[PDB]
Every structure is written in structure tokens, then in C-alpha cells.
């Protein structure tokens, strides 16, 4: 309570869930299911 580190306090960010790889996954699903269902 008296000998704490001398440093600038660090602030965390609310982690955002990555939708980019979600969209890649949807494109993969489309690519794998389209040729069978369209013909």
C-alpha cells in the first residue's frame, strides 16, 4: 500500500468480437454448399 510501482496506469479496451473471420466462414459455407444445391 506504500511501495507500489511508479508507472503510468494501463487501460484495457472492451474486446470487440472479430466478424471478419465470421464472414470468411460464411463465404466458405457458401462455396462448399453451392455446387451441390444449385445442380
Amino acid at each position: 500500500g506504500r511501495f507500489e510501482r511508479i508507472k503510468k496506469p494501463l487501460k484495457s479496451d472492451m474486446n470487440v468480437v472479430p466478424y471478419i473471420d465470421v464472414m470468411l466462414v460464411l463465404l466458405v459455407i457458401f462455396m462448399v454448399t453451392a455446387p451441390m444445391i444449385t445442380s
Binding site: 487501460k11 479496451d13 472492451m14 470487440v16 468480437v17 466478424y19 465470421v22 460464411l26 444445391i37
Partner: protein, 219 residues
């Protein structure tokens, strides 16, 4: 425009409830972003105005009197007026100088904390929206795939029409989830950063005020 407006209807009631909640959440989030942006801009303008008024070199009791006449005061002009007030409330008394400065410290800290808490009105709501909306979007997608498979398990010859509306529900749910989840997290992060900047500026100003009061008090 009309095709999506068609496919949102004739959906399963649970997924329709999902799109309704996410659209209301998106609208509420955008309203909060606009209001918080306006509030922070006004706070910055008042901060800079009071900064240039105080460091102009005017006499201290004049600034206190101008704080007295103003009734719609807010921000630093309030917190200033509060802290120095206690200082005078300690200067009418024969309190020692160190205790005087400590009391002014404490009143300034209370004022800063209270006003900054009153500044971030609905930021927590943005946090909650940005943290919950991906969950609801994933729930909608999962339920859409559920309904697609239930429809598929009882038609035998599985056409496109028996699997279309489940997949359509899943993509619409995940799209609305992304659309109502990203501007909430981004606005939360940006506005927390701006709030920290404002608080740092206010704290530095309050400390400079304590320095001036102490230097005037020592004589």
C-alpha cells in the same frame, strides 16, 4: 430494400423477436452516441473558455464573484466555485494553511468526480449493448439453422424452399448482430478515451489552482 423487408416478415416468431430487439438496440445506441458526442463537445468548449478566462491574469475574487452571478454555471466554473468556496469557508476560520489546502484538495476532488460521473451518462448502456449483441446475433443464427434442419427432417425430397427460410433467418440475424454490435463497442472505446482525456485536463487544472492558492496563502 423491399426484399429484406419481405424476408424479415414470415419468419419464426423467436427470430423475429431477435431482429426487433437488435434494431431497437441499434437505434438506442445511435441516439446515445449522438447525445454523448454533443455533451462532450459542449464540455470541451466550456473547459477551454474557462481556461482562457482564468489564465488571463484577472483577480481571483473577481472570478469568484462572476461564479456567484452565474446560476446556469456547469463544469469547471462550478467545480472551481465549489473548491475555492470551501477555501473561503476555511479562511473565515483560523484554520492552519496545510489543513486549508487539504480541505480545498478534498472539495476539488469531490467536485471533479461528481461532474465526471454526471458526464458519462449512458456509456454503460453502450458497454452492455456492445457486449450482449453478439450473443443475441449468434442465438438468432443458431435458431435459424435449427429451423432449417427441422424443416429438412420432415419433407423427404429436400428442395430449396424447405431449407431457404432457416438460412435466410441465420444470415439476417448475424448481419443485424454485427450492425448493432460494432458501433457500440467502437463508440464505447472512443468515448472512454475522450473522457479520460477530459478528466486528466480537469485534474491538471485543479492542481494548478491548488498551486496558485498555496502560493498566494504563504504570502
Amino acid at each position: 430494400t423491399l426484399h429484406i423487408s419481405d424476408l424479415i416478415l414470415q419468419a419464426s416468431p423467436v427470430v423475429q423477436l431477435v431482429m426487433l430487439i437488435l434494431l431497437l438496440a441499434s437505434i438506442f445506441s445511435w441516439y446515445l452516441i449522438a447525445k454523448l458526442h454533443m455533451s462532450y463537445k459542449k464540455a470541451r468548449q466550456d473547459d477551454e473558455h474557462f481556461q482562457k478566462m482564468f489564465w488571463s491574469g484577472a483577480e481571483l475574487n473577481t472570478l469568484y464573484n462572476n461564479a456567484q452571478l452565474n446560476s446556469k454555471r456547469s463544469g469547471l466554473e462550478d467545480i472551481f466555485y465549489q473548491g475555492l468556496s470551501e477555501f473561503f469557508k476555511l479562511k473565515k476560520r483560523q484554520a492552519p494553511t496545510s489543513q486549508m489546502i487539504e480541505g480545498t484538495e478534498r472539495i476539488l476532488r469531490v467536485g471533479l468526480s461528481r461532474d465526471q460521473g454526471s458526464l458519462e451518462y449512458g456509456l454503460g448502456t453502450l458497454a452492455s449493448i456492445g457486449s450482449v449483441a453478439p450473443y443475441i446475433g449468434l442465438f438468432g443464427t443458431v435458431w435459424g439453422i435449427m429451423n432449417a434442419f427441422i424443416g429438412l427432417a420432415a419433407v423427404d425430397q429436400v428442395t430449396l424452399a424447405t431449407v431457404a427460410p432457416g438460412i435466410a433467418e441465420a444470415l439476417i440475424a448475424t448481419a443485424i448482430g454485427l450492425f448493432a454490435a460494432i458501433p457500440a463497442v467502437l463508440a464505447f472505446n472512443h468515448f472512454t478515451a475522450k473522457s479520460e482525456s477530459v478528466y486528466s485536463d480537469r485534474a491538471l487544472f485543479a492542481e494548478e489552482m491548488i498551486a496558485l492558492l498555496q502560493r498566494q496563502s504563504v504570502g
